[PDB]
């Protein structure tokens, strides 16, 4: 496993893009087990339409053919608030797009393709897989439909099959 992007291993120094500006995802620094644990989250679940996006940085491919996405996150239930699931959900979409050069601050929510709806199994952790990769690099974006999700760690890697062994002890 060659890790391409790990968010928890950065230590808050890795900043992502939050669209739009006012509401949406926010980088929060919580302390657990006497150590800081950063996280992106949003819990705006009482309003109506919210296309809250969160685009990552540039991840160089190098030799990545099929990438795997690991998501360490927590989800709060909807029946806790006195809302009766008006606009509260327990899932969020995951998108992905390609790019040869780092756009920087540019974020167009039309070049991204929906991979799959992330559903919980309370540290609900699920893993995805998509491919193949064509261009020199790619981006990753998280979309909130109005759920209360706290994203802790994101791991992106590709699996490498090691050298096969010959039965004659080489």
């Amino acid at each position: 496993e060659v890790v391409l992007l790990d968010f928890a291993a950065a230590g808050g120094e890795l900043g992502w893009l939050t669209h739009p500006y006012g509401k949406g995802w926010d980088l929060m620094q919580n302390i657990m087990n006497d150590m800081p644990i950063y996280m992106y989250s949003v819990c705006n679940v009482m309003s109506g339409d919210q296309d809250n996006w969160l685009r990552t940085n540039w991840v160089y491919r190098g030799e990545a053919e099929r990438i795997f996405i690991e998501l360490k996150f927590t989800v709060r239930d909807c029946n806790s608030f006195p809302g009766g699931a008006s606009s509260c959900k327990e899932t969020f979409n995951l998108y992905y797009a390609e790019s040869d050069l780092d756009y920087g601050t540019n974020f167009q929510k039309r070049l991204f393709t929906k991979i799959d709806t992330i559903a919980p199994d309370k540290l609900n952790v699920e893993e995805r897989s998509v491919g193949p990769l064509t261009r020199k690099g790619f981006y990753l974006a998280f979309q909130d439909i109005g759920a209360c999700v706290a994203l802790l760690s994101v791991r992106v890697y590709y699996k490498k099959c090691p050298e096969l062994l010959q039965h004659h002890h080489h």
């Binding site: 808050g12 926010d26 980088l27 929060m28 620094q29 919580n30 302390i31 657990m32 087990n33 006497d34 150590m35 644990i37 950063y38 989250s41 949003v42 819990c43 705006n44 679940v45 009482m46 309003s47 927590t74 709060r76 806790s80 608030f81 540290l123 209360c148 999700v149 706290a150």
Partner: protein, 114 residues
């Protein structure tokens, strides 16, 4: 529009926050918990702003509630009617958090998902 909720109502009191506790004039929000949810432990949560980063700190709900009780009691006649309902909530929320409250509901490390 109204009360905006927090993703993690639960937290765990670390023995480092006493050394790195934010002062009173830096706390953004004082999000509390319920005697039924979040394992029924008396626990509060403070929010701050450290370089465009929303810093969350776990805080003892007993001491923080008694702190606000003294702040409203210090106002006396200058206290608003909604401030008296704040004192009203802290009065029964404390006496409801104190009932029971053995070593089981004192273990805050249950919500320490690291």
């Amino acid at each position: 529009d109204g009360i905006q909720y927090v993703a993690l109502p639960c937290c765990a009191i670390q023995a480092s926050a006493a050394s790195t506790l934010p002062l009173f004039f830096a706390v953004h929000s004082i999000h509390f918990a319920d005697p039924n949810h979040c394992n029924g432990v008396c626990i509060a949560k403070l929010r701050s702003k450290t370089g465009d980063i929303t810093v969350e700190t776990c805080v003892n709900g007993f001491n923080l509630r008694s702190f606000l009780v003294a702040v409203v009691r210090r106002l006396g006649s200058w206290a608003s009617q909604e401030n008296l309902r704040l004192l009203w909530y802290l009065q029964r929320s404390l006496t409801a958090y104190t009932v029971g409250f053995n070593a089981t509901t004192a273990d805050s490390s249950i919500h320490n998902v690291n």
